[PDB]
Amino acid sequence: KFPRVKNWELGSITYDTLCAQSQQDGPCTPRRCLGSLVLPRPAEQLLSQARDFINQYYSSIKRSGSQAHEERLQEVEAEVASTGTYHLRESELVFGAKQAWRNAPRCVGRIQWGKLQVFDARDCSSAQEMFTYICNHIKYATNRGNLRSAITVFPQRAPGRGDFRIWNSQLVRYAGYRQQDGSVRGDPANVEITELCIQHGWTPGNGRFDVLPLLLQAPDEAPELFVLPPELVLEVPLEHPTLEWFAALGLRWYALPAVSNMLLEIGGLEFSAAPFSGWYMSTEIGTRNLCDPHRYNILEDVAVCMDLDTRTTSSLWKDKAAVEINLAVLHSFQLAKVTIVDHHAATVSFMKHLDNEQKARGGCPADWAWIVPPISGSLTPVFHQEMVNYILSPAFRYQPDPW
Amino acid sequence: GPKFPRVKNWELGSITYDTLCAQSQQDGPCTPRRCLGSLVLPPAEQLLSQARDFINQYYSSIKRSGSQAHEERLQEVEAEVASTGTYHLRESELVFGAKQAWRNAPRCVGRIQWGKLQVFDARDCSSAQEMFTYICNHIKYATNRGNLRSAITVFPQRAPGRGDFRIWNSQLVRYAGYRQQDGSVRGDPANVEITELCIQHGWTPGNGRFDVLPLLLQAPDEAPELFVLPPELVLEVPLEHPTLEWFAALGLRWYALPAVSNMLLEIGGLEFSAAPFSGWYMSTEIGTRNLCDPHRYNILEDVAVCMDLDTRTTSSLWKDKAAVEINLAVLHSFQLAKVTIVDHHAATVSFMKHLDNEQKARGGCPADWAWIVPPISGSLTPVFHQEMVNYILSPAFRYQPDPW
Ligand code: HEM
Ligand code: HEM
Ligand SMILES: N=C(Nc1cccc(COC[C@@H](CN)OCc2cccc(/N=C(/N)c3cccs3)c2)c1)c1cccs1
Ligand SMILES: N=C(Nc1cccc(COC[C@@H](CN)OCc2cccc(/N=C(\N)c3cccs3)c2)c1)c1cccs1
Ligand SMILES: C[C@H](O)[C@H](O)[C@H]1CNc2nc(N)[nH]c(=O)c2N1
Ligand SMILES: C[C@H](O)[C@H](O)[C@H]1CNc2nc(N)[nH]c(=O)c2N1
Ligand SMILES: [Zn+2]
């Protein structure tokens, strides 16, 4: 039985046959669905993942069964049999990184998947060198506000030694300073990394939007601290198109979302440090980062400024303030000429993506809870779209924190 | 760690383990290879085991497990099944089972109320005319002039050979949907099929946007019969907005009583094919889904234009702004009319309370995250941040094929 996938707004039906290509189990069983959980609840092994990936590559370039194909499978085989591991060619790495993005079920931005700048940093041997590559990535991806998706791939995990890691969860994160009275100044999501930085010798600030240094770690060495040059970190002050007091809130966000703690897996090889970046969808900032109760939690402040009745849920004060805050983000990014996409445009392009992928591959792995935006869910076409979630490789995965 | 699903709340940092899912006797649609959680619609000795399990649940709930009363009931059920192929529930077992089915429903955000359900036992009903009388009484009781009371009416169970009692309509109150010459719809497009069935069965159709449908009621082995709800039994709320004075001019309205009539209530393997139940609305059901879905009344653009918003560009957030005011209008109008309604913030807070209660009572709670999270303002509600485990327990409300 292959899944029947229905769109409830349009009445149309497709069948996902791509899910038969999945080789890794998810969290669900017949007895119970664990779909809403955030985190996951030998040589022959490597060799079959490696061959499968080599097959994916030669098929993508329309050279399946070529002499080039047969000989590359022999190289991979020879190298695994002798050494227990193998190495990718740059062109395979490029193909693999794009496929890992294509395959990411939680990503609404996958219409863009073919357009990814891949920096090969596999010749990196020190934390100092990782920093140089990271600075070049930021400069390239930022591009004065005309954002360009990029990934930098540092050296693969190797059976002997420690991993290359970027300890920070993103390349740009704001500090979170825990008070003696438990409360937090700045971003509560970043309390632990903030403390790690101070402990490794960073002189901390005391503002709401202090940009953290990077803790970069080469194998089996303590991490090293590197402050990002302020000119490399583009930020956008937040103002509202009609509410004058909104700028008085002193709010800002950074332009460049760059995730730096996920493991990249290609053909059985694992890249423990492979930071990737694109551009933001406005609800990430406007709704989650600014309005989550465990984040900057600004809903009440904005509601009061708007003079809303805060004493009762049924005035929909939270909803009204969230909308204005999202509007402010979109407005302020647009005024700063910094790439951003609203949740309506983003979900519409994802629907087009689902259709491209249906034709190209016979399905598309998608995690409904992550694709539907955190405000105005049913106002976007993705709410009414059934989705099938499953794990294809190449993949981005979670990995343990290195401390 | 415990060998049970670990469930995390990301707002609070707290962890529970669901041990109740161990009581699931019935598979869902997911496998290790793929998750199908977002899909909307994904006996002889078999009866006896379902029956025994249910009787065991009953005697547990009254604290007499392994008692002599418990063992005699088991024997009596097997005897009844032995000689008749079926069995029948005691009044108090029916009441316990109907509440349990509600308690068990993974898609219901209103379950904090599960213990407060008026169970009307209509297992003596023998005609479509009598079903109608029972339904009118249900509506009068549940509506209670706007102070809504949860209720279920239970018609006779499916019986070997004999045809089912069925209510053909999906709810007791539905507005007509009339297919137009140009291909668009007047009224509620959700109800085009039931509207045309009403016409095929002799109803004289109106032509407004909010025409209440007649009921199509079917007693065993008979053609359904058509019944018009007396207008004064169907409480409606005209919609106005607290500050936008033109909103009243739109002539929008919704009915007070949501009463689902096409689900099958399954208890101990017995099947109640006609068992309409009612509670009250969460405001987003009306203001977001019913009024704003593109395939429903689809009023977003009309409202946005009245608000003078920029409908030519997604990034004005015109849809979001209009939807908020429409939801506000629903809340304000039900409040002014003194008709029970619950907003999506208050409903989700109470559901978080429900989760805590069930963790202590039963060691978990089956919940369908996609359905529990409201359709506007998702992450503004505490349920967004709460992991949930979905599984099927019995007694259960289930979908059943349409009678036609
Ligand atoms: C080009 C613009 C892009 C947009 C607008 C975008 C949008 C998003 C959004 C909104 C999320 C959910 C994030 C959250 O809730 O915290 C996400 C998830 C993700 N996207 Fe993207 N995406 C983009 C490009 C990329 C790129 C370049 C990659 C990698 C090459 C990527 C890989 C991912 C992955 C792996 C996830 C899931 C992370 C997780 O499971 O925790 N996306 N995407
Ligand atoms: C007391 C007030 C109640 C509220 C506010 C409420 C709220 C809701 C809401 C919003 C839904 C989702 C409906 C949709 O999106 O179409 C739902 C689903 C459901 N509720 Fe309730 N509920 C209430 C009482 C009841 C009662 C009395 C029963 C039955 C005894 C019930 C059983 C159900 C079932 C079976 C579903 C799932 C329908 C399906 O799977 O298709 N609830 N509830
Ligand atoms: N507040 C309430 N809301 C509520 C509770 C439960 C159900 C409902 C409304 O029914 C939900 C229904 C309608 N969208 O969703 C499930 C469903 C069931 C059956 C058919 C559906 N759609 C179709 N048209 C089909 C496609 C293929 C076969 S049928 C969809 C509303 C209450 C009602 C009763 C007590 S509380
Ligand atoms: N627009 C973008 N946004 C984006 C894309 C992907 C990811 C992200 C941000 O990461 C999401 C993260 C952070 N909330 O959520 C999931 C997560 C991942 C890993 C660990 C998590 N939890 C923990 N670290 C734990 C704490 C205590 C025990 S475990 C939680 C943002 C882009 C980023 C890069 C290209 S596009
Ligand atoms: C419990 C729940 O799965 C969790 O809050 C998820 C829901 N959907 C999400 N969707 C996105 N895009 N990002 C998230 O962090 C989450 N969090
Ligand atoms: C495809 C998707 O499952 C579908 O649109 C669901 C999503 N969540 C829902 N949630 C509720 N409460 N009611 C619904 O009808 C739906 N529809
Ligand atoms: Zn699942």
mmCIF file of C-alpha atoms in Angstrom, chain A residues 1 3-6 8-10 19-39 41 282 287-288 291-294 299 312-320 322-324 326-327 330 334 342-345 366 368-370 372-379 383-391, chain B residues 1-8 10-11 17 21-41 241 288-289 292-295 300 314-321 323-325 327-328 331 335 343-346 369-371 373-380 384-392:
data_model
loop_
_atom_site.group_PDB
_atom_site.id
_atom_site.type_symbol
_atom_site.label_atom_id
_atom_site.label_comp_id
_atom_site.label_asym_id
_atom_site.label_seq_id
_atom_site.Cartn_x
_atom_site.Cartn_y
_atom_site.Cartn_z
ATOM 1 C CA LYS A 1 0.000 0.000 0.000
ATOM 2 C CA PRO A 3 -0.064 6.356 0.586
ATOM 3 C CA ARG A 4 -2.952 8.252 -0.981
ATOM 4 C CA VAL A 5 -2.332 12.015 -0.429
ATOM 5 C CA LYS A 6 -5.386 14.290 -0.619
ATOM 6 C CA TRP A 8 -8.825 19.084 0.914
ATOM 7 C CA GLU A 9 -9.168 22.557 -0.631
ATOM 8 C CA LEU A 10 -8.941 21.357 -4.260
ATOM 9 C CA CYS A 19 8.439 6.699 0.366
ATOM 10 C CA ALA A 20 9.357 3.159 -0.837
ATOM 11 C CA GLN A 21 12.933 4.584 -1.282
ATOM 12 C CA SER A 22 13.224 5.264 2.494
ATOM 13 C CA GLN A 23 15.901 3.181 4.278
ATOM 14 C CA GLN A 24 15.700 4.744 7.772
ATOM 15 C CA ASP A 25 12.864 4.320 10.292
ATOM 16 C CA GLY A 26 11.009 7.314 11.742
ATOM 17 C CA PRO A 27 9.454 7.394 15.291
ATOM 18 C CA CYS A 28 5.996 6.037 14.401
ATOM 19 C CA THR A 29 4.554 2.464 14.678
ATOM 20 C CA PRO A 30 1.056 0.991 13.960
ATOM 21 C CA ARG A 31 0.216 1.300 17.744
ATOM 22 C CA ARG A 32 1.038 5.096 18.000
ATOM 23 C CA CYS A 33 1.974 8.132 15.900
ATOM 24 C CA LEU A 34 4.975 10.145 17.231
ATOM 25 C CA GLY A 35 4.886 12.569 14.280
ATOM 26 C CA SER A 36 4.795 15.667 16.541
ATOM 27 C CA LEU A 37 8.004 14.816 18.470
ATOM 28 C CA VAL A 38 10.792 17.409 17.735
ATOM 29 C CA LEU A 39 13.788 15.059 18.309
ATOM 30 C CA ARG A 41 12.815 9.168 20.291
ATOM 31 C CA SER A 282 9.046 36.272 8.407
ATOM 32 C CA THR A 287 6.044 34.944 15.599
ATOM 33 C CA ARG A 288 8.471 32.426 17.119
ATOM 34 C CA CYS A 291 6.524 36.023 20.570
ATOM 35 C CA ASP A 292 7.281 32.547 22.012
ATOM 36 C CA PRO A 293 6.780 32.756 25.795
ATOM 37 C CA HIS A 294 10.179 31.100 26.297
ATOM 38 C CA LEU A 299 3.372 40.080 23.027
ATOM 39 C CA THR A 312 -9.189 38.664 28.711
ATOM 40 C CA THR A 313 -8.269 36.076 26.044
ATOM 41 C CA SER A 314 -11.443 36.793 24.058
ATOM 42 C CA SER A 315 -10.329 40.312 22.945
ATOM 43 C CA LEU A 316 -7.799 38.373 20.804
ATOM 44 C CA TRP A 317 -5.099 40.799 21.974
ATOM 45 C CA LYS A 318 -2.389 38.175 21.424
ATOM 46 C CA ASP A 319 -3.536 37.625 17.828
ATOM 47 C CA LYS A 320 -3.708 41.354 17.062
ATOM 48 C CA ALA A 322 1.329 39.058 16.753
ATOM 49 C CA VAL A 323 0.060 40.271 13.383
ATOM 50 C CA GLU A 324 1.464 43.781 13.834
ATOM 51 C CA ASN A 326 4.981 40.150 11.806
ATOM 52 C CA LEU A 327 4.046 43.168 9.698
ATOM 53 C CA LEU A 330 8.298 42.318 6.825
ATOM 54 C CA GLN A 334 11.816 45.379 2.949
ATOM 55 C CA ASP A 342 6.246 36.052 4.148
ATOM 56 C CA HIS A 343 4.398 32.831 5.101
ATOM 57 C CA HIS A 344 1.779 33.218 2.320
ATOM 58 C CA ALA A 345 4.312 33.529 -0.475
ATOM 59 C CA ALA A 366 7.125 16.770 4.350
ATOM 60 C CA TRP A 368 3.040 18.935 8.220
ATOM 61 C CA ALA A 369 3.499 20.380 11.791
ATOM 62 C CA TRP A 370 6.675 22.161 10.618
ATOM 63 C CA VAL A 372 2.258 24.971 8.317
ATOM 64 C CA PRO A 373 3.251 28.457 9.674
ATOM 65 C CA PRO A 374 2.783 29.302 13.407
ATOM 66 C CA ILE A 375 0.154 32.008 12.664
ATOM 67 C CA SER A 376 -2.712 31.896 10.144
ATOM 68 C CA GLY A 377 -2.252 28.115 9.530
ATOM 69 C CA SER A 378 -5.488 27.464 7.618
ATOM 70 C CA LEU A 379 -5.087 30.734 5.709
ATOM 71 C CA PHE A 383 -2.805 23.514 5.948
ATOM 72 C CA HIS A 384 -5.263 21.714 3.605
ATOM 73 C CA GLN A 385 -2.598 19.524 2.069
ATOM 74 C CA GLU A 386 -1.989 15.992 3.375
ATOM 75 C CA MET A 387 1.730 15.219 3.623
ATOM 76 C CA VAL A 388 3.745 12.014 4.137
ATOM 77 C CA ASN A 389 6.846 12.265 6.334
ATOM 78 C CA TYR A 390 9.818 9.936 5.802
ATOM 79 C CA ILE A 391 13.601 9.894 5.776
ATOM 80 C CA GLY B 1 14.709 5.643 30.434
ATOM 81 C CA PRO B 2 11.132 4.233 30.476
ATOM 82 C CA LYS B 3 10.201 1.974 27.463
ATOM 83 C CA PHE B 4 7.274 4.220 26.497
ATOM 84 C CA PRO B 5 6.973 7.257 24.230
ATOM 85 C CA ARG B 6 8.738 10.246 25.762
ATOM 86 C CA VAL B 7 6.606 13.387 25.386
ATOM 87 C CA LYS B 8 8.191 16.869 25.669
ATOM 88 C CA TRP B 10 9.196 22.750 24.618
ATOM 89 C CA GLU B 11 7.827 25.890 26.266
ATOM 90 C CA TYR B 17 5.980 9.191 29.279
ATOM 91 C CA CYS B 21 -0.788 3.875 24.453
ATOM 92 C CA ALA B 22 -0.070 0.299 25.687
ATOM 93 C CA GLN B 23 -3.865 -0.141 25.941
ATOM 94 C CA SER B 24 -4.342 0.549 22.220
ATOM 95 C CA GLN B 25 -5.824 -2.636 20.708
ATOM 96 C CA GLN B 26 -6.125 -1.047 17.266
ATOM 97 C CA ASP B 27 -3.584 0.122 14.656
ATOM 98 C CA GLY B 28 -3.298 3.637 13.257
ATOM 99 C CA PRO B 29 -2.002 4.470 9.726
ATOM 100 C CA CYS B 30 1.753 5.015 10.472
ATOM 101 C CA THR B 31 4.696 2.608 10.157
ATOM 102 C CA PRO B 32 8.470 2.892 10.973
ATOM 103 C CA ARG B 33 9.083 3.719 7.244
ATOM 104 C CA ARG B 34 6.498 6.606 7.006
ATOM 105 C CA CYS B 35 4.310 8.906 9.079
ATOM 106 C CA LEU B 36 0.692 9.385 7.893
ATOM 107 C CA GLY B 37 -0.422 11.519 10.883
ATOM 108 C CA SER B 38 -1.626 14.435 8.712
ATOM 109 C CA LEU B 39 -4.078 12.294 6.688
ATOM 110 C CA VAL B 40 -7.714 13.227 7.534
ATOM 111 C CA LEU B 41 -9.179 9.728 6.848
ATOM 112 C CA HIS B 241 -17.994 43.429 15.107
ATOM 113 C CA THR B 288 -11.545 30.856 10.625
ATOM 114 C CA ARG B 289 -12.613 27.557 8.977
ATOM 115 C CA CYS B 292 -12.648 31.847 5.710
ATOM 116 C CA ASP B 293 -11.709 28.469 4.096
ATOM 117 C CA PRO B 294 -11.412 29.009 0.326
ATOM 118 C CA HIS B 295 -13.729 26.019 -0.169
ATOM 119 C CA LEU B 300 -11.603 36.861 3.592
ATOM 120 C CA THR B 314 0.697 38.747 0.322
ATOM 121 C CA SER B 315 3.114 40.830 2.420
ATOM 122 C CA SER B 316 0.452 43.306 3.633
ATOM 123 C CA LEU B 317 -0.819 40.409 5.837
ATOM 124 C CA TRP B 318 -4.348 41.291 4.715
ATOM 125 C CA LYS B 319 -5.540 37.734 5.164
ATOM 126 C CA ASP B 320 -4.242 37.562 8.701
ATOM 127 C CA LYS B 321 -5.719 40.936 9.675
ATOM 128 C CA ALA B 323 -9.258 36.682 9.784
ATOM 129 C CA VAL B 324 -8.490 38.122 13.226
ATOM 130 C CA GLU B 325 -11.358 40.641 12.979
ATOM 131 C CA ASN B 327 -12.817 35.725 14.727
ATOM 132 C CA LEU B 328 -13.284 38.728 17.006
ATOM 133 C CA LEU B 331 -16.622 35.965 19.849
ATOM 134 C CA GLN B 335 -21.048 36.893 23.889
ATOM 135 C CA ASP B 343 -12.040 31.177 22.163
ATOM 136 C CA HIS B 344 -8.965 29.269 21.016
ATOM 137 C CA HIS B 345 -6.746 30.644 23.810
ATOM 138 C CA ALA B 346 -9.100 29.601 26.598
ATOM 139 C CA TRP B 369 -1.541 17.612 17.128
ATOM 140 C CA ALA B 370 -2.644 18.830 13.673
ATOM 141 C CA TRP B 371 -6.269 18.958 14.841
ATOM 142 C CA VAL B 373 -3.603 23.212 17.290
ATOM 143 C CA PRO B 374 -6.023 25.965 16.189
ATOM 144 C CA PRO B 375 -6.046 27.169 12.573
ATOM 145 C CA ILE B 376 -5.013 30.769 13.386
ATOM 146 C CA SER B 377 -2.386 31.838 15.912
ATOM 147 C CA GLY B 378 -0.952 28.291 16.372
ATOM 148 C CA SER B 379 2.222 29.085 18.369
ATOM 149 C CA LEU B 380 0.408 31.734 20.389
ATOM 150 C CA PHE B 384 1.675 24.180 19.744
ATOM 151 C CA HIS B 385 4.659 23.676 22.074
ATOM 152 C CA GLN B 386 3.348 20.372 23.433
ATOM 153 C CA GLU B 387 4.348 17.028 21.848
ATOM 154 C CA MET B 388 1.395 14.619 21.573
ATOM 155 C CA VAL B 389 1.040 10.836 20.923
ATOM 156 C CA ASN B 390 -1.873 9.769 18.721
ATOM 157 C CA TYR B 391 -3.473 6.282 19.051
ATOM 158 C CA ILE B 392 -6.906 4.709 18.990
#
